[PDB]
Amino acid sequence: ATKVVCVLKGDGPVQGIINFEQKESNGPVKVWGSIKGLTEGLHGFHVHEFGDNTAGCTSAGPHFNPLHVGDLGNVTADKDGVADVSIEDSVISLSGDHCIIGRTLVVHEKADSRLACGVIGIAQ
Amino acid sequence: TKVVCVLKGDGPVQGIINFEQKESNGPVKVWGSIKGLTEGLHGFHVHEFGDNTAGCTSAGPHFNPHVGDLGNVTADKDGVADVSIEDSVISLSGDHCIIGRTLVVHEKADDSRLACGVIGIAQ
């Protein structure tokens, strides 16, 4: 897989679609998309260990950090509550030890609770 | 290796399905429950894409690197289907790996897509 996608949903208004692409094995991963329903300002953005939505975002487990690897920084919401995301990350991967396929992406209430999340799935 | 899938759709169909594989060349155990179904048989399939941007529609075709065909599940008179399957064609590693793909339960028996979810790594 060179492309994966995540649909973020939660108990409140936060929702979005985030794409990840890694055209070269072990290469940088491009992350992009949009999230709406957020309070204006900065929000933590993290891959968590488990792609387990049995208890909503509360079952996603800890930040992904194999022996954080899953820490993607903050996303920024504007006055309309929309965060446009465009990130490059060379620590996460779509293969190998830092593989994020089948894990959970979470957008958090605070800047670095879990507002929305989804399982990271194969898109291509 | 353990994975889980939460099935959700536009109507009453919902469930939690677990998969476990003890060794890479071994059978995958599949177990869980689905509720909200019409009594009787329902197709049960892994689809190619873990893409839920258009609900179950964006999941694409049956996974077939079909490998994804898990047979039918059977719902009782209360609409509950118990899932207890062992499958040696799907895998949680290698080329038949289903992690990050979509599980779908279908309206019709195998001879619409009622609910689906992306298959994720579990504790």
CATH of the domain at A109: 2.60.40.200
Exposed/middle/buried for A41, CB within 10 Å: 0-12, 13-18, 19+? middle
Give the SS3 label for residue B62. strand
What is the DSSP secondary structure assignment for residue A12, as one 8-state letter?
Answer: S
Any binding-site annotation on A80? no
Q: How far is CA B55 from CA A108, B9, B16, B38, B88, in A?
A: 24, 7, 17, 20, 28
Any binding-site annotation on B96? no
Other C-beta atoms within 10 Å of A23: how many?
Answer: 11
Beta-bridge partners for A114: A108
B4 interfaces chain A, CB cutoff of 8 Å: yes
What kind of experiment solved this structure?
X-ray
B12 Cβ contact partners less than 8 Å away, ≥ 6 residues apart: B35, B36, B79
Alpha helices in chain A (DSSP H): none
- Closest CB to A121 among B3, B50, B122: B50
CA pair distance B70, B30, nearest whole angstrom:
9
Q: If you count them, how many residues does chain A have? A: 124
Other C-beta atoms within 10 Å of B81: how many?
Answer: 23
Beta strands in A22-79 (DSSP E): 29-36, 41-48, 54-57, 71-77
Other C-beta atoms within 10 Å of B83: how many?
Answer: 18
C-beta separation of A2 from A27 below 8 A: no
Per the listing, tokens 């690197």 go with B65
Q: What is the resolution of this structure in A?
A: 1.4
C-alpha dihedral (B21, B7, B38, B77), degrees to nearest 10: 60
Any binding-site annotation on A98? no
- Domains in chain A, number: 1
Query: In chain B, what is the greatest distance between 2 CA atoms, to the nearest angstrom?
Result: 39
Pair of tokens at residue B78: 């209360």
Half-sphere CA count of B2, side-chain side, radius 13 A: 7
CB spacing of B53 vs A7 below 8 angstroms: yes
B19 Cβ contact partners less than 8 Å away, ≥ 6 residues apart: B2, B3, B4, B5, B28, B29, B30, B90, B92, B98, B119
CA pair distance B71, B90, nearest whole angstrom:
12
CB spacing of B121 vs A1 below 8 angstroms: no
Q: Which residue of B has its CA nearest to A49?
A: B121
B60 sits in the region (left: phi over 0; alpha: psi -120 to 50; else beta) called left
Q: Quick one: which H or E segment has residue A109?
A: none
Note which residues in 18-47 of chain A have CB less than 8 A from chain B. Answer: none
C-beta separation of A6 from A105 below 8 A: yes
Pair of tokens at residue A57: 């975002």
Range of the domain at A9: 1-124
Half-sphere CA count of A41, side-chain side, radius 13 A: 6
A101 interfaces chain B, CB cutoff of 8 Å: yes
CA pair distance A67, A89, nearest whole angstrom:
18
| Nearest alpha carbon to residue B102 among A50, A4, A47 | A4
| Nearest alpha carbon to residue A2 among A19, A17, A16, A23 | A23
